[PDB]
Amino acid sequence: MAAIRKKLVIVGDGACGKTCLLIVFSKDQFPEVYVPTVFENYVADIEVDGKQVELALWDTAGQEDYDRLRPLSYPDTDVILMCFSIDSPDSLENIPEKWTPEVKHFCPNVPIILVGNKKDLRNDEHTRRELAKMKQEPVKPEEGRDMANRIGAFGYMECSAKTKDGVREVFEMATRAALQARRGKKKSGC
Amino acid sequence: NYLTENPHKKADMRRQDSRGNTVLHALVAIADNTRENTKFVTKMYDLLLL
Amino acid sequence: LSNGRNDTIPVLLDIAERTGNMREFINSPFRDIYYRGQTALHIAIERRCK
Ligand SMILES: Nc1nc2c(ncn2[C@@H]2O[C@H](COP(=O)(O)OP(=O)(O)O)[C@@H](O)[C@H]2O)c(=O)[nH]1
Numbered sequence: 001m002a003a004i005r006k007k008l009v010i011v012g013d014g015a016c017g018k019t020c021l022l023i024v025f026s027k028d029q030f031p032e033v034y035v036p037t038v039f040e041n042y043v044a045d046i047e048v049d050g051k052q053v054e055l056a057l058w059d060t061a062g063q064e065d066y067d068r069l070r071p072l073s074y075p076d077t078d079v080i081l082m083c084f085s086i087d088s089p090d091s092l093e094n095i096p097e098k099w100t101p102e103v104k105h106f107c108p109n110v111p112i113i114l115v116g117n118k119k120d121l122r123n124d125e126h127t128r129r130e131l132a133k134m135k136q137e138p139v140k141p142e143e144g145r146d147m148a149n150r151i152g153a154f155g156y157m158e159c160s161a162k163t164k165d166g167v168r169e170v171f172e173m174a175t176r177a178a179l180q181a182r183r184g185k186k187k188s189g190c
Numbered sequence: 191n192y193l194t195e196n197p198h199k200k201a202d203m204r205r206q207d208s209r210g211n212t213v214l215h216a217l218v219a220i221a222d223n224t225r226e227n228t229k230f231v232t233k234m235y236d237l238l239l240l
Numbered sequence: 241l242s243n244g245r246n247d248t249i250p251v252l253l254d255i256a257e258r259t260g261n262m263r264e265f266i267n268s269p270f271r272d273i274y275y276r277g278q279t280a281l282h283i284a285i286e287r288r289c290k
Pocket residue numbers: 012013014015016017018019020021035037061118120160161162163
């Protein structure tokens with residue numbers, strides 16, 4: 001009828017595929033040569049259940065001087081995809097440590113989807129050997145499920161930008177979570 | 191007239207802002223009781239409705 | 241705006257598309273809490289230049 005505008009924001013460690021995830025969502029064509037540090041000023045059309053939603057996709061990077069301007073993207077945020085890398089175990093443990101408190105501080109009572117990207121690389125021989133060099137292993141799905149339960153995640157999926165696996169369903173569930181308008185107020189003052 | 195009807199992209203009149211106010215709530219919000227204001231507020235309201 | 245017409249808007253837009261990122265340029269919002277969300281389109285409409 002009249003498309004509804006919902007704000008989606010991505011926060012995660014660098015090199016975990018956030019920008020590539022949004023890009024594959026946008027044009028459905030993997031950029032093999034050039035990837036911008038951020039994907040900006042885009043709105044995409046999605047229909048999930050009889051409702052037509054324009055999703056405005058913001059992107060946050062922290063490489064150089066973007067961290068100072070990151071807080072400014074959090075206001076009026078409707079839904080968040082907290083993202084991390086499956087082929088990089090270091091990404092997971094920082095999510096409870098540093099990413100979560102900033103998200104809670106600037107924008108509370110917001111839905112959050114914890115996602116792990118690039119399922120293909122966990123079975124890759126090169127990444128497996130590199131992790132085994134430090135007596136490590138790729139992030140197990142069980143650990144991701146436990147984390148999703150642990151930090152209040154609305155849902156937990158996995159993406160693959162190269163193979164375009166699960167992006168459509170991931171963003172569908174993201175906008176489905178966004179369309180919910182929370183539950184009133186809790187301990188609201190007299 | 192141009193924004194609603196142009197080949198590139200059309201802004202439909204039924205869209206609501208963050209507050210939920212449609213173009214008509216917005217036109218009521220600026221509405222005042224001076225003649226200089228009502229004279230065009232009512233005209234634009236009828237135009238958009240039709 | 242000088243007498244309703246600035247000779248650099250077309251050149252800026254031409255350079256922007258030629259440089260590859262027209263989309264990100266035409267609609268870039270303000271970030272200060274005081275003007276959040278305001279677009280170049282808002283300025284064009286407010287200045288009353290069709
Ligand atoms: N082989 C492969 N590489 C990927 C995939 N997704 C992301 N990458 C790589 O991850 C790198 C950086 O990811 P990026 O989009 O910049 O994540 P960001 O740093 O959070 O913005 C890119 O150079 C890609 O080559 C994938 O599905 N397969």
